[PDB]
Swiss-Prot record:
Domain of life: Eukaryota
Organism of derivation: Mus musculus
Protein's name in the database: Gamma-crystallin S
GO BP terms: lens development in camera-type eye; morphogenesis of an epithelium
UniProt keyword list: Acetylation, Eye lens protein, Repeat
Encoding gene, per UniProt annotation: Crygs
Length: 177
């Protein structure tokens, strides 16, 4: 009955050393593991953070096996908390973006991923956006690179409403499966 996603962290490379298995979000795993240099994802998609309380660098990990941290693009082997990412299906994911805050300025509507916002819409920044269909991720650098943020069916009127300290956004993609 306890069906769910599962991730395993190993203190040494090649899944060697002490191992820890988690089946739910954990705000502080420091008491069970002092470091993690490799990870195995058996099911589900998870977000890992460099420091406790989902803070510091954040990385999205889909199901799969990573015998070494570099295979997950980790900056180092420090991980203090992890959360399971829930995927929403339904039909066609839809997002709208506005040039000014409070949904003002020019508006653009799209149902597909965008690798470079400036190349597609000639926009250098985005100050408001309404996502209400499926889940969407935004990335600070083109080609889905840099810090990434998970967006749910929500209405964002200010850039800080996205947890971002600046209205800078260069690419976004829809999450499926």
């Amino acid at each position: 009955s306890k069906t769910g996603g599962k991730i395993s962290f190993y203190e040494d490379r090649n899944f060697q050393g002490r191992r820890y298995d988690c089946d739910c979000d954990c705000a502080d795993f420091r008491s069970y593991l002092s470091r993690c240099n490799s990870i195995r994802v058996e099911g589900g998609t998870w977000a890992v953070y460099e420091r406790p309380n989902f803070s510091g660098h954040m990385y999205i990990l889909p199901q799969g096996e990573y015998p070494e941290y570099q295979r997950w693009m980790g900056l180092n082997d420090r991980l203090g908390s992890c959360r399971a990412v829930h995927l929403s299906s339904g039909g066609q994911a839809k997002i709208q973006v506005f040039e000014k805050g409070d949904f003002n300025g020019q508006m653009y509507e799209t149902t597909e991923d965008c690798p470079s916002i400036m190349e597609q819409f000639h926009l250098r920044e985005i100050h408001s956006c309404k996502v209400v269909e499926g889940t969407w991720i935004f990335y600070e650098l083109p080609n889905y690179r840099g810090r990434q943020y998970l967006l749910d069916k929500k209405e964002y009127r200010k850039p800080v409403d996205w947890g971002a300290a600046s209205p800078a956004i260069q690419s976004f993609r829809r999450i499926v499966e």
